[PDB]
Amino acid sequence: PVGRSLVVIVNDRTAHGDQDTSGPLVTELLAEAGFVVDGVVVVENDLSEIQNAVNTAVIGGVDLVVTVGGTGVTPRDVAPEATQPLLDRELLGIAEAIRSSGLAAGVTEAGLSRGVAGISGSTLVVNIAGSRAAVRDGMATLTPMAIQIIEQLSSLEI
Amino acid sequence: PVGRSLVVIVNDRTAHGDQDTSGPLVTELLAEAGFVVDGVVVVENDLSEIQNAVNTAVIGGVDLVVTVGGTGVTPRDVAPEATQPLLDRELLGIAEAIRSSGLAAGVTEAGLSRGVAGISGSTLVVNIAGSRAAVRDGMATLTPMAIQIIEQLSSLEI
Amino acid sequence: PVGRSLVVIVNDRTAHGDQDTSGPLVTELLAEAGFVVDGVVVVENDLSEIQNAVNTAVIGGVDLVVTVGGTGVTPRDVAPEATQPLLDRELLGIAEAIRSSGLAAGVTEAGLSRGVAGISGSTLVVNIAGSRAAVRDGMATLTPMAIQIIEQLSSLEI
């Protein structure tokens, strides 16, 4: 196994009982890249809830947290605002590659995603947009990068 | 019509009577994408003038403001410095896509543009470099993105 | 000659006597693009040493400083943290183009580089990752951009 992962669904409707159509796809793509999926957390578009969810993964030593949702242009979308202050160092390369690949694939919500990416504690944290198309394209870009970052951290033999 | 737009020409020479060769091209490309062009404002490379021009569009409820000029490497180029503090949220995807497309087209002043992009109030604000080549390539990248952001805002039915 | 350049090797091992395998390649690529190479400085992954090295080039009026190393994900990698506060204006276009080209070439440490770029005083400063592959790909992207920025500054006839 490459490492442990957690998925955070950032969606007001999912947090009140609607069918989450994105999370299972993220889970299966993580598993197919070789990650153990420790769990899925659903939160509202709420800064402190999102922070609590990520910080909980960070304190439990999770290797990869993928948040899904809350990267659009409306004031309610606060995943990036919630994430950025938790980052000890940003990895613009991840966020830029996700936007760039989504734009080339014609997935607008991915090209325009305000998502950030970085290391918090021992955890790689990456925001992706909420749609199935964004999760598909974002995950294809992200997972080899995440494998390399995580493999590099454990080859430090720290 | 997709929405209302304003063009802000940021150019010391144009502000003192020289022929503006970029503004008419921006106007015609906006019109061809379906925007009403409310007007054109000419300002110097001057932070408070640029801010006044943009804030005036913001308070009038304009949907898209394209600023043209003042994104180069010299100290006089202050469009990005003027713009960034007005943004309630940045849209790095727009600025990155404009740079990336300009670089692939060999338009140096576009690849290297310090331009930013984001939402201020109800207005999408985007900096592009001053040349005809930069306006051509920047507008081709920008206008479908702007249509999608604006169509999304009005489909909120707010 | 296009201008004067300095190379700063940011590497703990090189700073204690190991063979620097990257610096000669950077020197030869600079020379081949037409820069005079004023010198090479070796420093540790140490914020104040890196700053001293860059600020020394800035005060001596150097046109281009390329730093090599210290852009990875581990806490010891501090080239970007050292560089960013010295920049009077950032040139995201350079850093983004370096990441983007490295990603397309399959050079992971380049796609993921946290390197920044910008103008400090009269000096263009650009961080690249430490490997030979990163220096090869980064330099191919950087040197035409650097020539254009420097040629533009001296054509100001300031």
Tab-separated table of C-alpha atoms in Angstrom:
chain	number	residue	atom	x	y	z
A	1	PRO	CA	0.000	0.000	0.000
A	2	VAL	CA	1.254	3.510	-0.857
A	3	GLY	CA	-0.293	5.169	2.209
A	4	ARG	CA	-3.467	6.082	4.047
A	5	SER	CA	-6.070	8.534	2.695
A	6	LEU	CA	-9.201	10.413	3.771
A	7	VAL	CA	-11.916	11.998	1.663
A	8	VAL	CA	-13.708	15.116	2.838
A	9	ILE	CA	-16.946	15.862	0.910
A	10	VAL	CA	-17.650	19.586	1.128
A	11	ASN	CA	-21.312	19.919	0.197
A	12	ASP	CA	-24.297	21.535	2.001
A	13	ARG	CA	-26.796	19.214	0.351
A	14	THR	CA	-24.832	16.050	1.054
A	15	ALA	CA	-24.448	17.206	4.689
A	16	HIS	CA	-28.344	17.239	4.938
A	17	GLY	CA	-29.058	13.858	3.342
A	18	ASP	CA	-28.724	14.166	-0.438
A	19	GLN	CA	-27.052	11.443	-2.398
A	20	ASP	CA	-23.242	11.970	-2.609
A	21	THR	CA	-22.377	10.969	-6.187
A	22	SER	CA	-18.672	12.017	-6.035
A	23	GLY	CA	-17.277	10.387	-2.904
A	24	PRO	CA	-17.551	6.777	-4.081
A	25	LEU	CA	-15.673	7.676	-7.254
A	26	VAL	CA	-12.886	9.348	-5.218
A	27	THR	CA	-12.732	6.247	-2.909
A	28	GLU	CA	-12.469	3.836	-5.796
A	29	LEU	CA	-9.793	5.931	-7.605
A	30	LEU	CA	-7.756	6.166	-4.381
A	31	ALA	CA	-8.009	2.408	-3.858
A	32	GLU	CA	-7.062	1.750	-7.484
A	33	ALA	CA	-3.895	3.903	-7.049
A	34	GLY	CA	-2.994	1.766	-4.029
A	35	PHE	CA	-4.120	3.924	-1.043
A	36	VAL	CA	-6.040	2.600	1.911
A	37	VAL	CA	-9.141	4.750	2.333
A	38	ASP	CA	-9.507	5.266	6.085
A	39	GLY	CA	-12.911	6.935	5.719
A	40	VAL	CA	-15.120	9.644	4.228
A	41	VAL	CA	-16.256	12.764	6.101
A	42	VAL	CA	-19.166	14.938	4.973
A	43	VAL	CA	-19.190	18.611	5.991
A	44	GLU	CA	-21.077	21.760	5.059
A	45	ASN	CA	-19.535	24.738	3.296
A	46	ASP	CA	-18.388	26.009	6.587
A	47	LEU	CA	-14.869	27.064	7.351
A	48	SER	CA	-14.594	25.642	10.881
A	49	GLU	CA	-16.182	22.308	9.912
A	50	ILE	CA	-13.844	21.888	6.980
A	51	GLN	CA	-10.869	22.823	9.193
A	52	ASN	CA	-11.965	20.385	11.879
A	53	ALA	CA	-12.241	17.582	9.324
A	54	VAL	CA	-8.788	18.245	7.812
A	55	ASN	CA	-7.069	18.860	11.204
A	56	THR	CA	-8.516	15.557	12.407
A	57	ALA	CA	-6.871	13.732	9.503
A	58	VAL	CA	-3.619	15.658	10.207
A	59	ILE	CA	-3.537	14.700	13.858
A	60	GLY	CA	-4.277	11.026	12.988
A	61	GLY	CA	-1.223	10.970	10.672
A	62	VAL	CA	-3.147	10.485	7.418
A	63	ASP	CA	-0.894	10.673	4.281
A	64	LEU	CA	-3.424	12.123	1.798
A	65	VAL	CA	-6.577	14.155	2.273
A	66	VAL	CA	-8.629	14.954	-0.845
A	67	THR	CA	-11.444	17.475	-0.280
A	68	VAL	CA	-14.171	17.505	-2.970
A	69	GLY	CA	-16.401	20.559	-3.396
A	70	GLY	CA	-16.449	24.185	-2.321
A	71	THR	CA	-13.956	25.599	-4.862
A	72	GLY	CA	-16.357	27.667	-7.068
A	73	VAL	CA	-16.933	31.432	-7.289
A	74	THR	CA	-19.887	31.885	-4.901
A	75	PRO	CA	-19.389	33.149	-1.302
A	76	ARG	CA	-20.588	29.833	0.138
A	77	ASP	CA	-17.575	27.995	-1.498
A	78	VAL	CA	-14.952	28.162	1.281
A	79	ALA	CA	-12.784	25.027	0.924
A	80	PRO	CA	-9.721	27.025	-0.219
A	81	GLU	CA	-10.088	29.681	2.529
A	82	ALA	CA	-10.467	26.844	5.061
A	83	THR	CA	-7.442	24.932	3.725
A	84	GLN	CA	-4.766	27.597	3.040
A	85	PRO	CA	-4.198	28.623	6.712
A	86	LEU	CA	-3.515	24.993	7.678
A	87	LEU	CA	-0.717	24.563	5.137
A	88	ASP	CA	2.882	24.604	6.433
A	89	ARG	CA	3.955	24.818	2.794
A	90	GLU	CA	1.921	25.183	-0.393
A	91	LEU	CA	2.397	23.020	-3.483
A	92	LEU	CA	1.261	25.299	-6.225
A	93	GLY	CA	2.397	22.767	-8.786
A	94	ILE	CA	-0.408	20.394	-7.781
A	95	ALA	CA	-3.175	23.072	-7.847
A	96	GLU	CA	-1.857	24.520	-11.156
A	97	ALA	CA	-1.571	21.108	-12.839
A	98	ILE	CA	-5.176	20.261	-11.737
A	99	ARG	CA	-6.497	23.544	-13.199
A	100	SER	CA	-4.457	23.210	-16.360
A	101	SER	CA	-5.486	19.604	-17.054
A	102	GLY	CA	-9.169	20.407	-16.314
A	103	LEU	CA	-9.075	23.342	-18.731
A	104	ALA	CA	-7.498	21.207	-21.501
A	105	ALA	CA	-10.225	18.539	-20.876
A	106	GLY	CA	-13.009	21.162	-21.135
A	107	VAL	CA	-14.045	20.672	-17.487
A	108	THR	CA	-14.794	24.304	-16.617
A	109	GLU	CA	-15.310	23.871	-12.882
A	110	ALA	CA	-11.814	22.250	-12.786
A	111	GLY	CA	-10.042	24.889	-14.904
A	112	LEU	CA	-11.544	27.585	-12.728
A	113	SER	CA	-11.228	25.718	-9.373
A	114	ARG	CA	-9.914	27.943	-6.540
A	115	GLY	CA	-8.538	24.775	-4.911
A	116	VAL	CA	-5.180	24.894	-3.110
A	117	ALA	CA	-2.719	22.137	-2.215
A	118	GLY	CA	0.058	21.640	0.316
A	119	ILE	CA	1.541	19.819	3.326
A	120	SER	CA	-0.005	20.144	6.755
A	121	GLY	CA	1.915	18.240	9.439
A	122	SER	CA	2.649	14.866	7.758
A	123	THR	CA	-0.407	15.144	5.487
A	124	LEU	CA	-0.699	16.091	1.818
A	125	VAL	CA	-3.968	18.093	1.422
A	126	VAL	CA	-5.514	18.779	-2.007
A	127	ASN	CA	-8.791	20.546	-2.910
A	128	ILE	CA	-10.716	19.418	-5.999
A	129	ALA	CA	-14.022	20.660	-7.476
A	130	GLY	CA	-17.182	18.790	-6.674
A	131	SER	CA	-18.429	17.277	-9.972
A	132	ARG	CA	-17.799	13.759	-11.258
A	133	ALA	CA	-15.947	15.187	-14.258
A	134	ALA	CA	-13.659	17.278	-11.978
A	135	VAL	CA	-12.990	14.300	-9.666
A	136	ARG	CA	-12.136	12.110	-12.666
A	137	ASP	CA	-9.715	14.549	-14.243
A	138	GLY	CA	-8.296	15.901	-10.910
A	139	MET	CA	-7.608	12.452	-9.531
A	140	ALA	CA	-5.820	11.344	-12.750
A	141	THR	CA	-3.497	14.381	-12.383
A	142	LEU	CA	-3.146	14.150	-8.605
A	143	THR	CA	-2.559	10.528	-7.758
A	144	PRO	CA	0.847	10.071	-9.421
A	145	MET	CA	2.018	13.312	-7.791
A	146	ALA	CA	0.721	12.203	-4.399
A	147	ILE	CA	2.425	8.787	-4.727
A	148	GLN	CA	5.731	10.557	-5.460
A	149	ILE	CA	5.439	12.979	-2.539
A	150	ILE	CA	4.440	10.240	-0.099
A	151	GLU	CA	7.065	7.752	-1.390
A	152	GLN	CA	9.663	10.485	-1.009
A	153	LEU	CA	8.593	11.233	2.585
A	154	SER	CA	8.822	7.554	3.678
A	155	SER	CA	12.129	7.074	1.790
A	156	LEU	CA	13.502	9.856	4.070
A	157	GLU	CA	13.133	6.953	6.585
A	158	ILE	CA	12.192	9.602	9.223
B	1	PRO	CA	-26.881	39.512	-24.181
B	2	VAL	CA	-24.528	37.693	-21.777
B	3	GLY	CA	-23.915	40.732	-19.556
B	4	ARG	CA	-22.485	44.221	-19.294
B	5	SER	CA	-18.761	45.017	-19.632
B	6	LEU	CA	-16.294	47.877	-19.156
B	7	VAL	CA	-12.813	48.330	-20.570
B	8	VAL	CA	-10.144	50.154	-18.603
B	9	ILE	CA	-7.103	51.190	-20.709
B	10	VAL	CA	-4.099	51.516	-18.411
B	11	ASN	CA	-1.601	53.569	-20.393
B	12	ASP	CA	0.270	56.831	-19.596
B	13	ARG	CA	0.551	57.787	-23.251
B	14	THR	CA	-3.086	57.094	-24.061
B	15	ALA	CA	-4.068	59.133	-20.966
B	16	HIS	CA	-2.208	62.175	-22.558
B	17	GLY	CA	-3.627	61.945	-26.083
B	18	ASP	CA	-1.858	59.146	-27.961
B	19	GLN	CA	-3.819	56.851	-30.183
B	20	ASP	CA	-5.239	53.846	-28.234
B	21	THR	CA	-4.793	50.910	-30.627
B	22	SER	CA	-5.940	48.179	-28.163
B	23	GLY	CA	-9.257	49.388	-26.770
B	24	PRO	CA	-11.255	49.134	-30.001
B	25	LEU	CA	-10.095	45.545	-30.428
B	26	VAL	CA	-11.174	44.694	-26.848
B	27	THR	CA	-14.585	46.405	-27.483
B	28	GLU	CA	-15.192	44.503	-30.682
B	29	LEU	CA	-14.165	41.127	-29.143
B	30	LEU	CA	-16.468	41.753	-26.159
B	31	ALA	CA	-19.353	42.633	-28.474
B	32	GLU	CA	-18.673	39.572	-30.630
B	33	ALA	CA	-18.863	37.326	-27.503
B	34	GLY	CA	-22.258	38.872	-26.737
B	35	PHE	CA	-21.451	41.501	-24.040
B	36	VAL	CA	-22.805	45.014	-24.045
B	37	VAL	CA	-19.856	47.389	-23.761
B	38	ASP	CA	-20.989	50.118	-21.363
B	39	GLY	CA	-17.888	52.235	-22.003
B	40	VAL	CA	-14.109	52.625	-22.073
B	41	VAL	CA	-12.083	54.430	-19.396
B	42	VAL	CA	-8.512	55.628	-19.926
B	43	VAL	CA	-6.247	55.990	-16.882
B	44	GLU	CA	-2.557	56.473	-16.182
B	45	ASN	CA	-0.331	53.885	-14.539
B	46	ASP	CA	-1.454	55.119	-11.225
B	47	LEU	CA	-2.780	52.934	-8.479
B	48	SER	CA	-5.563	55.218	-7.217
B	49	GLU	CA	-6.794	56.049	-10.735
B	50	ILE	CA	-6.948	52.401	-11.693
B	51	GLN	CA	-8.745	51.596	-8.415
B	52	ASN	CA	-11.213	54.422	-8.950
B	53	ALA	CA	-11.989	53.176	-12.458
B	54	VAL	CA	-12.542	49.555	-11.348
B	55	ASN	CA	-14.481	50.494	-8.155
B	56	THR	CA	-16.741	52.668	-10.303
B	57	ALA	CA	-17.599	49.680	-12.496
B	58	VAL	CA	-18.120	47.571	-9.323
B	59	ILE	CA	-20.520	50.037	-7.768
B	60	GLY	CA	-22.470	50.338	-11.071
B	61	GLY	CA	-22.992	46.541	-11.097
B	62	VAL	CA	-20.916	45.833	-14.214
B	63	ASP	CA	-20.486	42.057	-14.925
B	64	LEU	CA	-17.028	42.135	-16.569
B	65	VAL	CA	-14.164	44.596	-16.357
B	66	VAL	CA	-11.139	43.957	-18.594
B	67	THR	CA	-8.124	46.184	-17.848
B	68	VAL	CA	-5.523	46.399	-20.651
B	69	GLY	CA	-1.960	47.483	-19.871
B	70	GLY	CA	0.256	47.905	-16.835
B	71	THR	CA	1.204	44.237	-16.267
B	72	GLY	CA	4.929	44.350	-17.275
B	73	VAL	CA	8.098	44.284	-15.151
B	74	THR	CA	8.830	48.018	-14.772
B	75	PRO	CA	7.887	49.939	-11.575
B	76	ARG	CA	5.386	52.089	-13.480
B	77	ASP	CA	3.262	48.938	-14.313
B	78	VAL	CA	0.817	48.841	-11.373
B	79	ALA	CA	-2.421	47.288	-12.698
B	80	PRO	CA	-1.960	44.080	-10.654
B	81	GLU	CA	-1.056	45.943	-7.422
B	82	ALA	CA	-4.108	48.173	-7.991
B	83	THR	CA	-6.428	45.221	-8.690
B	84	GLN	CA	-5.488	42.542	-6.106
B	85	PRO	CA	-6.674	44.481	-2.993
B	86	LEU	CA	-10.134	44.954	-4.537
B	87	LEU	CA	-10.702	41.229	-5.063
B	88	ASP	CA	-13.056	39.432	-2.642
B	89	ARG	CA	-11.790	36.190	-4.166
B	90	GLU	CA	-9.063	35.531	-6.726
B	91	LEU	CA	-9.501	33.314	-9.784
B	92	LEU	CA	-6.010	32.114	-10.395
B	93	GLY	CA	-7.290	29.796	-13.088
B	94	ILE	CA	-8.095	32.756	-15.346
B	95	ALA	CA	-4.704	34.511	-14.846
B	96	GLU	CA	-2.797	31.195	-15.241
B	97	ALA	CA	-4.700	30.172	-18.386
B	98	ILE	CA	-4.021	33.648	-19.930
B	99	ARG	CA	-0.274	33.348	-19.198
B	100	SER	CA	-0.112	29.760	-20.368
B	101	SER	CA	-1.948	30.386	-23.652
B	102	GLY	CA	0.153	33.528	-24.343
B	103	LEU	CA	3.367	31.576	-23.768
B	104	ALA	CA	2.254	28.757	-26.121
B	105	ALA	CA	1.364	31.433	-28.765
B	106	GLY	CA	4.810	33.076	-28.425
B	107	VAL	CA	3.317	36.323	-27.063
B	108	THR	CA	5.981	37.125	-24.461
B	109	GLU	CA	4.231	40.040	-22.775
B	110	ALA	CA	1.242	37.670	-22.221
B	111	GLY	CA	3.262	34.705	-20.910
B	112	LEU	CA	5.022	37.022	-18.502
B	113	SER	CA	1.967	39.199	-17.622
B	114	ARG	CA	1.673	39.917	-13.866
B	115	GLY	CA	-2.092	40.278	-14.397
B	116	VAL	CA	-4.497	38.989	-11.735
B	117	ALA	CA	-8.168	38.020	-11.935
B	118	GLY	CA	-11.069	37.704	-9.515
B	119	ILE	CA	-14.516	38.785	-8.282
B	120	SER	CA	-15.053	42.187	-6.736
B	121	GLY	CA	-18.633	42.736	-5.552
B	122	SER	CA	-20.732	41.378	-8.468
B	123	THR	CA	-17.973	42.094	-11.006
B	124	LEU	CA	-15.468	39.773	-12.675
B	125	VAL	CA	-12.176	41.741	-13.050
B	126	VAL	CA	-9.345	40.531	-15.318
B	127	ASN	CA	-5.993	42.187	-16.153
B	128	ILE	CA	-4.468	41.649	-19.603
B	129	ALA	CA	-1.230	42.992	-21.141
B	130	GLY	CA	-1.394	46.032	-23.344
B	131	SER	CA	-0.396	44.890	-26.868
B	132	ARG	CA	-2.728	43.887	-29.693
B	133	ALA	CA	-1.243	40.385	-29.677
B	134	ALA	CA	-1.874	40.026	-25.898
B	135	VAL	CA	-5.454	41.348	-26.217
B	136	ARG	CA	-6.141	38.914	-29.068
B	137	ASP	CA	-4.837	35.849	-27.277
B	138	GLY	CA	-6.055	36.903	-23.762
B	139	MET	CA	-9.570	37.631	-24.939
B	140	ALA	CA	-9.828	34.262	-26.775
B	141	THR	CA	-8.912	32.514	-23.479
B	142	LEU	CA	-10.966	34.798	-21.241
B	143	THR	CA	-14.317	35.261	-22.894
B	144	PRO	CA	-15.607	31.676	-22.643
B	145	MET	CA	-14.535	31.604	-18.985
B	146	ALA	CA	-16.239	34.928	-18.306
B	147	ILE	CA	-19.466	33.762	-20.012
B	148	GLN	CA	-19.480	30.669	-17.769
B	149	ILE	CA	-18.866	32.613	-14.556
B	150	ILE	CA	-21.493	35.231	-15.394
B	151	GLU	CA	-24.059	32.657	-16.633
B	152	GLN	CA	-23.512	30.743	-13.408
B	153	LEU	CA	-24.049	33.865	-11.267
B	154	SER	CA	-27.375	34.762	-12.974
B	155	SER	CA	-28.530	31.102	-12.916
B	156	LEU	CA	-28.192	31.356	-9.089
B	157	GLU	CA	-31.288	33.573	-9.708
B	158	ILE	CA	-30.054	35.788	-6.804
C	1	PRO	CA	26.678	39.614	-24.240
C	2	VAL	CA	23.071	39.648	-22.970
C	3	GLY	CA	24.004	40.401	-19.349
C	4	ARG	CA	25.748	39.200	-16.218
C	5	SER	CA	24.626	36.151	-14.203
C	6	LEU	CA	25.290	34.385	-10.896
C	7	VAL	CA	24.524	30.828	-9.857
C	8	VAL	CA	23.648	30.003	-6.270
C	9	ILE	CA	23.844	26.256	-5.448
C	10	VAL	CA	21.544	25.542	-2.514
C	11	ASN	CA	22.708	22.185	-1.186
C	12	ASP	CA	23.822	21.037	2.310
C	13	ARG	CA	26.040	18.302	0.914
C	14	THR	CA	27.713	20.511	-1.672
C	15	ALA	CA	28.310	23.116	1.076
C	16	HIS	CA	30.347	20.402	3.007
C	17	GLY	CA	32.480	19.117	0.128
C	18	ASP	CA	30.377	16.811	-2.053
C	19	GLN	CA	30.667	16.986	-5.785
C	20	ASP	CA	28.277	19.611	-7.281
C	21	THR	CA	26.966	17.952	-10.456
C	22	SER	CA	24.409	20.694	-11.341
C	23	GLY	CA	26.330	23.964	-11.209
C	24	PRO	CA	28.603	23.306	-14.192
C	25	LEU	CA	25.565	22.492	-16.318
C	26	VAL	CA	23.857	25.757	-15.257
C	27	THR	CA	27.114	27.696	-16.031
C	28	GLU	CA	27.459	26.183	-19.468
C	29	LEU	CA	23.756	26.760	-20.348
C	30	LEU	CA	24.020	30.396	-19.206
C	31	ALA	CA	27.160	30.902	-21.292
C	32	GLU	CA	25.534	29.239	-24.303
C	33	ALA	CA	22.556	31.673	-24.040
C	34	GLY	CA	25.049	34.551	-24.089
C	35	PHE	CA	25.368	35.516	-20.373
C	36	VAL	CA	28.641	36.192	-18.642
C	37	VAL	CA	28.793	33.986	-15.555
C	38	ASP	CA	30.291	36.175	-12.827
C	39	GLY	CA	30.594	33.264	-10.390
C	40	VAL	CA	29.024	30.389	-8.463
C	41	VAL	CA	28.134	30.516	-4.759
C	42	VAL	CA	27.473	27.415	-2.658
C	43	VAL	CA	25.232	27.741	0.407
C	44	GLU	CA	23.427	25.437	2.812
C	45	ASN	CA	19.660	25.127	3.061
C	46	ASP	CA	19.635	28.056	5.337
C	47	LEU	CA	17.441	31.070	4.902
C	48	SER	CA	19.950	33.759	5.916
C	49	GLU	CA	22.769	32.244	3.835
C	50	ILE	CA	20.585	32.051	0.763
C	51	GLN	CA	19.407	35.642	1.351
C	52	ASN	CA	22.970	36.849	1.807
C	53	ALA	CA	24.024	35.194	-1.451
C	54	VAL	CA	21.124	36.674	-3.463
C	55	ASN	CA	21.343	40.153	-1.824
C	56	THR	CA	25.051	40.189	-2.664
C	57	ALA	CA	24.264	39.632	-6.344
C	58	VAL	CA	21.533	42.328	-6.112
C	59	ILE	CA	23.850	44.915	-4.630
C	60	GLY	CA	26.541	44.122	-7.263
C	61	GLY	CA	24.009	44.836	-10.051
C	62	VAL	CA	23.858	41.286	-11.429
C	63	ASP	CA	21.175	40.838	-14.177
C	64	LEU	CA	20.247	37.179	-13.533
C	65	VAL	CA	20.537	34.981	-10.470
C	66	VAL	CA	19.564	31.310	-10.852
C	67	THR	CA	19.364	29.378	-7.562
C	68	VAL	CA	19.489	25.565	-7.899
C	69	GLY	CA	18.156	23.355	-5.104
C	70	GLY	CA	15.987	23.706	-2.025
C	71	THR	CA	12.547	23.721	-3.711
C	72	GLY	CA	11.223	20.285	-2.548
C	73	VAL	CA	8.630	19.368	0.096
C	74	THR	CA	10.851	18.740	3.145
C	75	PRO	CA	11.296	21.395	5.892
C	76	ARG	CA	14.995	21.775	5.071
C	77	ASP	CA	14.107	23.075	1.515
C	78	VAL	CA	13.928	26.854	2.083
C	79	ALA	CA	14.999	28.502	-1.201
C	80	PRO	CA	11.475	29.820	-1.927
C	81	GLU	CA	10.938	31.141	1.637
C	82	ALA	CA	14.368	32.811	1.411
C	83	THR	CA	13.664	34.328	-2.023
C	84	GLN	CA	10.047	35.604	-1.859
C	85	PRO	CA	10.665	38.382	0.741
C	86	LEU	CA	13.442	39.864	-1.420
C	87	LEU	CA	11.212	40.272	-4.475
C	88	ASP	CA	9.968	43.792	-5.308
C	89	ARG	CA	7.629	42.135	-7.803
C	90	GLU	CA	6.936	38.471	-8.524
C	91	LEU	CA	6.900	36.956	-12.011
C	92	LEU	CA	4.545	34.078	-11.596
C	93	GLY	CA	4.690	33.437	-15.315
C	94	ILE	CA	8.300	32.253	-15.038
C	95	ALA	CA	7.674	29.921	-12.037
C	96	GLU	CA	4.451	28.552	-13.623
C	97	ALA	CA	6.068	27.951	-17.026
C	98	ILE	CA	8.994	26.101	-15.311
C	99	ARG	CA	6.568	23.849	-13.385
C	100	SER	CA	4.366	23.276	-16.400
C	101	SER	CA	7.231	22.382	-18.753
C	102	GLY	CA	8.814	20.082	-16.114
C	103	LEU	CA	5.506	18.270	-15.625
C	104	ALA	CA	5.043	17.778	-19.402
C	105	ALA	CA	8.660	16.426	-19.581
C	106	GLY	CA	7.997	13.957	-16.724
C	107	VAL	CA	10.526	15.673	-14.426
C	108	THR	CA	8.610	15.369	-11.147
C	109	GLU	CA	10.876	17.522	-8.995
C	110	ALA	CA	10.369	20.317	-11.601
C	111	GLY	CA	6.576	19.970	-11.892
C	112	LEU	CA	6.319	20.067	-8.126
C	113	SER	CA	9.057	22.712	-7.532
C	114	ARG	CA	8.036	25.372	-4.965
C	115	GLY	CA	10.425	27.765	-6.739
C	116	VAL	CA	9.472	31.438	-7.113
C	117	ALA	CA	10.683	34.104	-9.537
C	118	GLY	CA	10.805	37.892	-9.629
C	119	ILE	CA	12.770	41.164	-9.735
C	120	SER	CA	14.853	42.282	-6.791
C	121	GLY	CA	16.512	45.667	-7.343
C	122	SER	CA	17.877	45.395	-10.923
C	123	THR	CA	18.174	41.596	-10.698
C	124	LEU	CA	15.962	38.842	-12.104
C	125	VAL	CA	15.939	35.981	-9.523
C	126	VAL	CA	14.655	32.486	-10.393
C	127	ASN	CA	14.580	29.300	-8.266
C	128	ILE	CA	14.980	25.920	-9.975
C	129	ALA	CA	15.047	22.377	-8.525
C	130	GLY	CA	18.371	20.750	-7.871
C	131	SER	CA	18.622	17.764	-10.267
C	132	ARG	CA	20.325	17.692	-13.662
C	133	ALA	CA	16.988	16.925	-15.319
C	134	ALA	CA	15.330	19.947	-13.609
C	135	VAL	CA	18.240	22.258	-14.533
C	136	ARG	CA	18.075	21.084	-18.156
C	137	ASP	CA	14.350	21.597	-18.554
C	138	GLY	CA	14.148	24.747	-16.322
C	139	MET	CA	16.975	26.492	-18.120
C	140	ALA	CA	15.445	25.764	-21.573
C	141	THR	CA	12.206	27.447	-20.377
C	142	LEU	CA	13.908	30.251	-18.456
C	143	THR	CA	16.674	31.581	-20.640
C	144	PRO	CA	14.557	33.028	-23.468
C	145	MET	CA	12.314	34.686	-20.869
C	146	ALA	CA	15.314	36.094	-19.018
C	147	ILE	CA	16.838	37.446	-22.263
C	148	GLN	CA	13.546	39.236	-23.009
C	149	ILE	CA	13.222	40.751	-19.533
C	150	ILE	CA	16.848	41.892	-19.468
C	151	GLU	CA	16.790	43.196	-23.079
C	152	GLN	CA	13.645	45.120	-22.204
C	153	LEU	CA	15.252	46.662	-19.095
C	154	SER	CA	18.349	47.897	-21.009
C	155	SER	CA	16.197	49.123	-23.941
C	156	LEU	CA	14.485	51.406	-21.355
C	157	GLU	CA	17.951	53.077	-21.640
C	158	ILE	CA	17.657	53.903	-17.886
